[PDB]
From Swiss-Prot, chains A, D:
Organism: Bacillus subtilis (strain 168)
Entry's family note: Belongs to the MecA family.
Positions spanned in the full protein: 125 to 218 of 218
Annotated protein name in UniProt: Adapter protein MecA 1
Described function: Enables the recognition and targeting of unfolded and aggregated proteins to the ClpC protease or to other proteins involved in proteolysis. Acts negatively in the development of competence by binding ComK and recruiting it to the ClpCP protease. When overexpressed, inhibits sporulation. Also involved in Spx degradation by ClpC.
Subunit note: Homodimer.
Comment, domains: The N-terminal domain has binding sites for ComK and ComS and probably for unfolded/aggregated proteins; the C-terminal domain interacts with ClpC.
Residues in the signal sequence: none
From Swiss-Prot, chain C:
UniProt domain Clp R: residue ranges: 1-142
Function of the protein: Competence gene repressor; required for cell growth at high temperature. Negative regulator of comK expression. May interact with MecA to negatively regulate comK.
Region (Repeat 1): 4-69
Annotated TM spans: none
Upper lineage: Bacteria, Bacillati, Bacillota, Bacilli, Bacillales
Protein family: Belongs to the ClpA/ClpB family. ClpC subfamily.
Protein name: Negative regulator of genetic competence ClpC/MecB
Length: 94, 79, 160, 94
């Protein structure tokens, strides 16, 4: 199915709320665009149900964007890469 | 009645300044210098919204007035 | 709206029960779905059960989408998907008459809100999502009111 | 065919009229809705002819409503539970 999902969070603060209970074994990269923070989760070493599973949790604070990942990869604006959720907890929780 | 929030119109103004600080801080990083800015932002934001319906107390206080004087003001108001 | 019927509001509150009971910070869409089938009967509840989705069928998938814990129920409001499902029932009842929203509209609304956790529960349990929205609809009859129906009188009155 | 019918009465006085010779071994339930009284007869331990038979009689005092039964059960309004006709003879003949 899919092992990479593209999530939009309404503003950063939503991602923070989320980050603090999902960071995954999924390298993940977080952009800011339109002042809203997008989170691109890229599941590495997961199965499709396992991703739908996890992806539920993520989407307790987010929704699933229809925006193609290659649009991000070209014209995006990075804030934290690789372990974006992990980093957002650092750079936001307190 | 609802000429502001409770006069807590200033709150929204604050929340603006936060978002900015937050936003711009996170765009540069200012990692933990963004941290506290997020927390201050969405904390504030929700607080605003809590007190934006605190002049729903001003709704339960005020929100039916269609009285003599009220009407009368209108009757003079239009002409 | 705050001018919904009981039935809607009930599937929704059943969502929160599953929020903490399955451990979810925010009451996910998976719980709104559970809410429909866990109220047993109701046109939604029944509907899922028609397709063969009893509480049994649903919850196995649901726990496999968000397991326990998260029993904290961290700022339990809905998930944004699940919040959409509530908005959805309101319109899913407007179109189908109903100014006061019932169970049915929420199941219909789930289908609409088809990337939601609920939606995936049903599309994982072999029941087509539209097969479910159908099912609610075909039990959402919405009989005559403001008028009556029970027979046919008159001949000449017809053309005029 | 079915052994449960939803009949519409135009006024309460109609409900007495049905009650005043019909119960029918059929527990039966009387609703109020848009000032019309619906009467739901539910024949238990009767055959199709015995019910069609009876249903003739019923429709001397009532007419045959177009009401979908789960609609009634949900969005209706109770006056007397199963045993409604029995109850009505008290509650509308006195």
């Amino acid at each position: 199915q899919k092992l990479q999902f593209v999530l939009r969070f309404g503003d950063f603060e939503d991602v923070i709320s989320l980050s603090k209970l999902n960071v995954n074994g999924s390298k993940t990269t977080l952009y800011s665009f339109e002042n809203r923070y997008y989170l691109y989760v890229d599941f590495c070493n997961m199965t499709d149900e396992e991703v739908e599973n996890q992806l539920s949790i993520l989407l307790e604070y987010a929704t699933e964007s229809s925006i193609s990942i290659h649009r991000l990869e070209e014209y995006g604006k990075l804030i934290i890469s690789e372990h974006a959720l992990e980093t957002i907890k650092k750079h936001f929780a307190s | 009645s609802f000429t502001t929030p409770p006069n807590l119109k200033e709150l929204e103004q604050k929340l603006d300044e936060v978002r900015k600080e937050k936003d711009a801080a996170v765009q540069s990083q200012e990692f933990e210098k963004a941290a506290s800015l997020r927390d201050t932002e969405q904390r504030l934001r929700e607080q605003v919204e809590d007190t934006k319906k605190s002049w729903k107390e001003k709704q339960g206080q005020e929100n039916s007035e269609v009285t003599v004087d009220d009407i009368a003001m209108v009757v003079s108001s239009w002409t | 709206f705050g001018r919904f019927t009981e039935r809607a509001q009930k599937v929704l509150a059943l969502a929160q029960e599953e929020a903490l009971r399955l451990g979810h910070n925010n009451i996910g869409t998976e719980h709104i779905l559970l809410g429909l089938v866990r109220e047993g009967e109701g046109i939604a509840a029944k509907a899922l059960q028609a397709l063969g989705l009893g509480s049994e069928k649903i919850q196995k998938e649901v726990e496999s989408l968000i397991g326990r814990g998260q029993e904290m129920s961290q700022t339990i409001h809905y998930t944004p998907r699940a919040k959409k499902v509530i908005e959805l029932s309101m319109d899913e009842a407007r179109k189908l008459g109903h100014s006061y929203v019932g169970t049915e509209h929420i199941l219909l609304g789930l289908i609409r809100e088809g990337e939601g956790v609920a939606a995936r529960v049903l599309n994982n349990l072999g029941v087509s999502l539209n097969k479910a929205r159908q099912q609610v609809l075909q039990l959402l009859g919405s009989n005559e009111t403001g008028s009556s129906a029970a027979g046919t009188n008159s001949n000449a009155n017809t053309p005029t």
